[PDB]
Design a protein around this motif. Structure first.
Motif, PDB file in Angstrom:
ATOM      1  N   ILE B  19      50.725  39.949 -17.209  1.00  0.00           N
ATOM      2  CA  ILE B  19      50.900  38.651 -16.576  1.00  0.00           C
ATOM      3  C   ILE B  19      50.571  37.702 -16.897  1.00  0.00           C
ATOM      4  N   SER B  20      49.081  37.605 -17.209  1.00  0.00           N
ATOM      5  CA  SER B  20      48.248  36.383 -17.456  1.00  0.00           C
ATOM      6  C   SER B  20      48.624  35.842 -18.861  1.00  0.00           C
ATOM      7  N   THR B  21      48.942  36.636 -19.926  1.00  0.00           N
ATOM      8  CA  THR B  21      49.343  35.875 -21.196  1.00  0.00           C
ATOM      9  C   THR B  21      50.691  35.421 -21.367  1.00  0.00           C
ATOM     10  N   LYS B  27      52.943  28.396 -19.122  1.00  0.00           N
ATOM     11  CA  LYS B  27      52.435  26.950 -18.725  1.00  0.00           C
ATOM     12  C   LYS B  27      52.425  26.027 -19.936  1.00  0.00           C
ATOM     13  N   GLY B  28      52.247  26.796 -21.230  1.00  0.00           N
ATOM     14  CA  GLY B  28      52.417  25.769 -22.341  1.00  0.00           C
ATOM     15  C   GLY B  28      53.882  25.169 -22.274  1.00  0.00           C
ATOM     16  N   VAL B  29      54.838  25.847 -22.160  1.00  0.00           N
ATOM     17  CA  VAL B  29      56.216  25.477 -22.448  1.00  0.00           C
ATOM     18  C   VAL B  29      56.747  24.487 -21.004  1.00  0.00           C
ATOM     19  N   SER B  53      54.325  33.679  -6.683  1.00  0.00           N
ATOM     20  CA  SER B  53      53.716  34.961  -6.444  1.00  0.00           C
ATOM     21  C   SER B  53      52.548  34.850  -7.378  1.00  0.00           C
ATOM     22  N   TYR B  54      52.574  34.450  -8.709  1.00  0.00           N
ATOM     23  CA  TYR B  54      51.466  34.447  -9.559  1.00  0.00           C
ATOM     24  C   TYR B  54      50.356  33.644  -9.191  1.00  0.00           C
ATOM     25  N   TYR B  55      50.545  32.482  -8.516  1.00  0.00           N
ATOM     26  CA  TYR B  55      49.308  31.627  -7.869  1.00  0.00           C
ATOM     27  C   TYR B  55      48.752  32.263  -6.573  1.00  0.00           C
ATOM     28  N   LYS B 148      61.033  36.823 -24.697  1.00  0.00           N
ATOM     29  CA  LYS B 148      60.803  38.107 -23.631  1.00  0.00           C
ATOM     30  C   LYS B 148      60.677  37.616 -22.236  1.00  0.00           C
ATOM     31  N   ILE B 149      60.299  36.475 -22.175  1.00  0.00           N
ATOM     32  CA  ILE B 149      59.988  35.778 -20.620  1.00  0.00           C
ATOM     33  C   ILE B 149      60.885  35.030 -20.350  1.00  0.00           C
ATOM     34  N   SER B 150      61.333  35.004 -18.812  1.00  0.00           N
ATOM     35  CA  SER B 150      62.262  34.339 -18.224  1.00  0.00           C
ATOM     36  C   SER B 150      61.711  33.343 -17.038  1.00  0.00           C
ATOM     37  N   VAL B 151      61.951  32.159 -17.189  1.00  0.00           N
ATOM     38  CA  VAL B 151      61.243  31.439 -15.940  1.00  0.00           C
ATOM     39  C   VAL B 151      62.535  30.453 -15.326  1.00  0.00           C
ATOM     40  N   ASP B 152      62.566  30.851 -14.153  1.00  0.00           N
ATOM     41  CA  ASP B 152      63.638  30.140 -13.235  1.00  0.00           C
ATOM     42  C   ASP B 152      62.888  28.671 -12.951  1.00  0.00           C
TER      43      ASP B 152
END
Ligand SMILES: O=C(N[C@H]1CCCC[C@H]1C(=O)O)c1cnn2c(O)cc(-c3ccccc3)nc12
Ligand SMILES: O=C(N[C@H]1CCCC[C@H]1C(=O)O)c1cnn2c(O)cc(-c3ccccc3)nc12
Ligand SMILES: [Zn+2]
Ligand SMILES: [Zn+2]
Lengths: 348, 353
Positions: B19-21, B27-29, B53-55, B148-152
C-alpha cells in the motif's frame, strides 16, 4: 487555608465584566489600527495574534491594562543565532516588501520599529479619546502603549511570523508528550513561530500562541473541566500564582528586589509543574489547597536552585544570575515562605 | 474467537508495504497533476485533500485509491434541494464565471472542465491514463490508471463559511471528544462534491453534496477521550481495529455474494458511519480496552445489525439524512445482509478464514 484561596478566586471573577467591556474598547481601536497599517506596503500582511492572559482566561491584572501582539507575515526568512543565546537571532532573507528595513543583509528591528511606531502615532491622532506612548527600556517589545479613554492601557508588540520549522534550540522543548500527547506536540510544532524585536539588531523567539493553546486545552482528557466529574484546578493554580507574585511586587514596589520578576516566570514554572504532574486526577478541584501548595513549592525550588528553563527553549535559563541576582531570589523566596506559613495574608 | 480477529488484523498488516509504495506512486502523479491544474485560472485554488482510508490508517481491502481535490472558491451561498438536507445548489455572494448557469454554479459544467483538463494533462504524463467515472453522479469524476494502480478522483469545492443548518445537531462528539473539539472542527471548512440528487434530467443534475471526509479523518486519527490514547501500553484501545474488521467483514461478504444484487448498494461508508455512532454511544477509552477486542467487535457488529433491522443509520454529520432509508436500500437487501452477518457471527466468522 484552602477556603482563602477560593475567596481570592471569587473576587478575581468579579472583574470579568470590566475586563470584557475594556477589551471590547481595545478591540475597536486595535481593529482600526490594523486596517490603517495594512494600507502600508511594508505592513500589508499585518494581523492580530490573539494571545495574552485575556485570551487565556487567566487575566488577573488590572482591567485597564492589556497586552496585544500584531503579527506580520514575512518572506521565508533565514535565522542566525546571536552569541549561542538560543533565544535571540538575526533575521536574514532567503530571497521584498521589508527591503526598506534592511541594514546590509539583516532585517533592522530599529528601522522596522521606527516605521511601526510612526504609523501608529499618526493614526491615533484620528481616533477619538486615544493617545500613544513609546514603551521605553524594553528592547523594542512592547513597541508602543496606547491610552484609551484616559482609562485603558494597551501595550502593542510587533512580531514577525515564520511558517518554517522551529529553530534547533526548541528541539528538546515543549515536553508535553506524557501530558497533552506526542500527537499534540507534533501538531503544535507545525504551527508558525514568532520573533519579537528585542535587543544589536536581534529578535527573540515567541510562542505566545502555543502557550494560549496549552492553557485553554490543558487536560490529558479532552473533556477536562467540561463536566463535574472532570473539574480540575490547573487554571486556578496559575491564577493564584500570578496573583501572589503581583501582590508581592506591589507590596515591595518601593524596594528594587522584585522588579525583575514577572508573570512569565510563574507561567513558565506552572508549565513545568504540568509536565511533572501530567494526570488530571493529580489536579482534582477538591485538592485545590494541596495543588496550589505544590505549585508554590515548585516555584520556590526553582528560585533556590536558580533554574527555570524557558518551556520551549530548554537551554535558556530564565533564572540565570545574568538575569536575576541571587539576593532578589532570596528575597522572593523568604517573602513567599512567610506568606505560605501564615495562610497568605497578602491575599487578605 | 477473538484470536481469529487478531489473525485477520495481522494479515491485513502484511499489505502495509505494498500500500505504501503504491501510495507513493499515486502521490507523484497526483502532485504533478495538481501543479499543472493550478495553472488554469479556474483551478488556481486546487489542492490535495488529505483524506481517505490510507490517511486514516484503515485501508484494508485493496492497489485502488480514492483521492479528493479541494477547490478554494469565493464565498458560497447554499440553497437546499428538496428538503434533502445533504444536496444543495451553489450560488455566490469570480474565477468560476464561465461555469454558472444562471445564478447557480453548474456541477455539469464544472465536471466537464475538470475532466477536460485532467485528460489534457494526463496525455503528457507517461505510464498514466485516465478514464471517465460514470454512474456515480459525478463523484468520483475520473479514474487514473497508473502503470496496476487505479485512483478515483473527486472534485470538492471548499467553503469556509459556517456549516449548513442541516448539520446543527450532528457530530455528536461532545461526551467523547469534547465540546471544545466539536467547536474547533465546526470552524474548519466544509466541502461540496458534484452529485446528482436523484436520477433523471433536470435540476437534480446540478446539485452538490456535503462532504466532511477531512473531519472523519481527524476523528479517526485522534479518536480517544484521552489525548494519549494508543500512545502507550496502558492506553491501547481497539477502536481502529474494530473499524478495520467491520470494513473487512462487509467487503468479504460483498465479494462472496457478488452474484446477487442484494449487497451492491452497501459500502464501507455505512459501516464507517455505524462505527462513529458506536463511538458516541461508548465514549470512554476503558470501554475499548484491547483485552476486550472480541467483545468490542461483537458490540460493533450488533450495533450495525440493529441499524439494519430498524432501517435507521443517520449520516453522522447530517442527522436527518437516513442512509438506510427505503429510498436508498430496499428492506430485502437489509434483511439478507442481516442474516449473513448473523450466520458469520454465530460461526466465528468463516469469511475471515
Ligand atoms: O515577561 C516576559 N519575560 C521577562 C522574564 C523572562 C526574561 C525576559 C523578560 C522580558 O523580556 O521582559 C515575557 C512575557 N512573554 N514572554 C515570552 O513569550 C517569551 C519570553 C522569553 C524569555 C526568554 C527567552 C525567550 C523568550 N519572555 C516573555
Ligand atoms: O460511499 C459513500 N456513500 C454511499 C452510501 C451512502 C449513501 C450515498 C452513497 C454514494 O454516494 O455512493 C460515501 C463515501 N464517502 N462519503 C461521504 O464522505 C459522504 C457521503 C454522504 C452520504 C449521504 C449524504 C451525505 C453524504 N457518502 C459517502
Ligand atoms: Zn481541567
Ligand atoms: Zn486509542
Amino acid at each position: 487555608g484552602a477556603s482563602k484561596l477560593r475567596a481570592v478566586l471569587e473576587k478575581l471573577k468579579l472583574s470579568r465584566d470590566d475586563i470584557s467591556t475594556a477589551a471590547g474598547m481595545v478591540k475597536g481601536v486595535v481593529d482600526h489600527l490594523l486596517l490603517r497599517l495594512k494600507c502600508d506596503s511594508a505592513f500589508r500582511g499585518v494581523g492580530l495574534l490573539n494571545t495574552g492572559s485575556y485570551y487565556e482566561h487567566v487575566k488577573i491584572s488590572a482591567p485597564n491594562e492589556f497586552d496585544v501582539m500584531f503579527k506580520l507575515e514575512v518572506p521565508r526568512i533565514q535565522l542566525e543565532e546571536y552569541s549561542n543565546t538560543r533565544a535571540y537571532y538575526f533575521v536574514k532573507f532567503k530571497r521584498n516588501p521589508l527591503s526598506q528595513f534592511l541594514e546590509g543583509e539583516i532585517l533592522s528591528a530599529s528601522k522596522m520599529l521606527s516605521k511601526f511606531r510612526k504609523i501608529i502615532k499618526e493614526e491615533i491622532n484620528d481616533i477619538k479619546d486615544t493617545d500613544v506612548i513609546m514603551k521605553r527600556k524594553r528592547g523594542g517589545s512592547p513597541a508602543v502603549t496606547l491610552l484609551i479613554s484616559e482609562k485603558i492601557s494597551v501595550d502593542i508588540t510587533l512580531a514577525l511570523e515564520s511558517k518554517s520549522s522551529w529553530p534547533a534550540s526548541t528541539q528538546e522543548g515543549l515536553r508535553i508528550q506524557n501530558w497533552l500527547s506526542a500527537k499534540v506536540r507534533k501538531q503544535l510544532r507545525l504551527k508558525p513561530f514568532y520573533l519579537v524585536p528585542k535587543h544589536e539588531e536581534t529578535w527573540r523567539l515567541s510562542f505566545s500562541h502555543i502557550e494560549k493553546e496549552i492553557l485553554n486545552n490543558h487536560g490529558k482528557s479532552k473533556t477536562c473541566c467540561e463536566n463535574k466529574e472532570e473539574k480540575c484546578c490547573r487554571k486556578d493554580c496559575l491564577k493564584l500564582m500570578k496573583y501572589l507574585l503581583e501582590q508581592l511586587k506591589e507590596r515591595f514596589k518601593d524596594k528594587k528586589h522584585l522588579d525583575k520578576f514577572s508573570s512569565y516566570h510563574v507561567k513558565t514554572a506552572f508549565f513545568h509543574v504540568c509536565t511533572q504532574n501530567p494526570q488530571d486526577s493529580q489536579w482534582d478541584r477538591k485538592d485545590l489547597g494541596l495543588c496550589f501548595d505544590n505549585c508554590v513549592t515548585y516555584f520556590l525550588q526553582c528560585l533556590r536552585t536558580e533554574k527555570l528553563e524557558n518551556y520551549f527553549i530548554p537551554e535558556f535559563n530564565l533564572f540565570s544570575s545574568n538575569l536575576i541576582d541571587k539576593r532578589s531570589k532570596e528575597f522572593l523566596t523568604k517573602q513567599i515562605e512567610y506568606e505560605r506559613n501564615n495562610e497568605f495574608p497578602v491575599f487578605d
